[PDB]
Amino acid sequence: GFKQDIATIRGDLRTYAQDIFLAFLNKYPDERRYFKNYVGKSDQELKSMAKFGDHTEKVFNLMMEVADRATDCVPLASDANTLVQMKQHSSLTTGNFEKLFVALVEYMRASGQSFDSQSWDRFGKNLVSALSSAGMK
Amino acid sequence: GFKQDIATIRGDLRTYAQDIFLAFLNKYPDERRYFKNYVGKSDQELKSMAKFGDHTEKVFNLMMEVADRATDCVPLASDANTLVQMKQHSSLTTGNFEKLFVALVEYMRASGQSFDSQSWDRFGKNLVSALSSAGMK
Numbered sequence: 001g002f003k004q005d006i007a008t009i010r011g012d013l014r015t016y017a018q019d020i021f022l023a024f025l026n027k028y029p030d031e032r033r034y035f036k037n038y039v040g041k042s043d044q045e046l047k048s049m050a051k052f053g054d055h056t057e058k059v060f061n062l063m064m065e066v067a068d069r070a071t072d073c074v075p076l077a078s079d080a081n082t083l084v085q086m087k088q089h090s091s092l093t094t095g096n097f098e099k100l101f102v103a104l105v106e107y108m109r110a111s112g113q114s115f116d117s118q119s120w121d122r123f124g125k126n127l128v129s130a131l132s133s134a135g136m137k
Numbered sequence: 138g139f140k141q142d143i144a145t146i147r148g149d150l151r152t153y154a155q156d157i158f159l160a161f162l163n164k165y166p167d168e169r170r171y172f173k174n175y176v177g178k179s180d181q182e183l184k185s186m187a188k189f190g191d192h193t194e195k196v197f198n199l200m201m202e203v204a205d206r207a208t209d210c211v212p213l214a215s216d217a218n219t220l221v222q223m224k225q226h227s228s229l230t231t232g233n234f235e236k237l238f239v240a241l242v243e244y245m246r247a248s249g250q251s252f253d254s255q256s257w258d259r260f261g262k263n264l265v266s267a268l269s270s271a272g273m274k
């Protein structure tokens with residue numbers, strides 16, 4: 001289930017973080033406009049960029065905490081508040097998050113793995129709802 | 138063959154019981170709804186709960202009794218009847234059992250072990266038929 005999936009991802013965090021973020025960027029290439037120096041590079045090129053590995057691990061480190069702190073895939077309002085208020089997230093709207101979780105869910109479905117993809121979809125939708133409540137447009 | 142697999146499973150009942158049951162829940166996450174006490178818990182959290190180990194071992198003990206009493210993977214009608222009449226199984230349909238046996242067979246195939254996966258598949262099919270013959274919807 002969802003709780004076990006958190007442990008699975010955490011067990012191989014760098015690999016999962018990079019592969020899922022890449023699935024996001026490749027499904028939604030224009031989402032690269034939010035980041036610096038990701039455009040014009042293949043997956044292997046990105047994976048050899050020190051900043052890429054560091055960033056994506058930090059994103060998924062926090063995502064797993066938000067998931068772990070959730071009850072029945074409903075995140076804490078305090079977690080939503082933090083994600084809205086982060087300076088690094090000032091250009092974002094809930095749509096950016098919708099797309100990330102669509103990509104993450106499709107990645108899980110496309111694996112040969114027993115991820116609880118429906119729970120991640122639910123969690124993504126609930127997070128978007130919480131971001132809206134916390135004041136993200 | 139099938140008889141050896143019964144011995145293999147019985148030899149380390151706790152471990153196989155937990156591992157196959159988790160395999161079942163992770164392949165068919167909606168099935169966790171029947172086990173309300175297991176909701177929102179990782180595989181390690183579950184193994185620390187007294188009733189998780191107890192229940193799962195008792196389930197697989199009974200499964201092995203039924204398997205051992207079968208002839209050529211055909212279970213006794215009385216054993217089918219017991220499974221149907223059980224209070225704990227009142228809300229179940231044959232589909233629930235099919236899912237369990239799909240996951241069990243997948244588990245056997247994925248293991249490095251020379252399980253007679255084909256016989257377990259057949260036993261599952263015959264049990265479902267006997268469950269139907271005994272009144273289960």
Ligand code: HEM
Pocket residue numbers: 031034035036054055058059060062063083088089092096097100
């Ligand atoms: C629940 C999902 C998300 C989490 C947990 C999260 C978390 C984080 C974290 C921890 C950082 C700081 C990383 C560091 O210091 O290296 C960060 C930075 C950043 N995030 Fe997110 N984020 C999420 C979703 C998004 C989305 C959907 C976008 C846009 C598509 C986005 C855009 C950015 C940008 C532009 C930065 C700064 C640039 C960079 O570090 O490369 N974030 N985020």
Ligand code: HEM
Pocket residue numbers: 168171172191192195196197199200225226229233234237
């Ligand atoms: C041949 C297959 C099965 C066998 C041999 C079996 C056997 C058992 C046994 C012995 C118990 C009582 C455990 C105890 O006394 O503590 C039990 C309880 C229960 N069974 Fe089954 N069962 C089977 C299939 C299923 C399936 C497929 C489901 C639904 C997915 C299910 C749902 C339940 C539930 C909800 C309980 C009570 C809660 C619990 O003990 O966890 N059973 N079963």
Ligand SMILES: [Xe]
Pocket residue numbers: 021059100
């Ligand atoms: Xe992201």
Ligand SMILES: [Xe]
Pocket residue numbers: 062066078079080082083
């Ligand atoms: Xe957060």
Ligand SMILES: [Xe]
Pocket residue numbers: 158196237
């Ligand atoms: Xe079960």
Ligand SMILES: [Xe]
Pocket residue numbers: 199203215216217219220
């Ligand atoms: Xe039984």
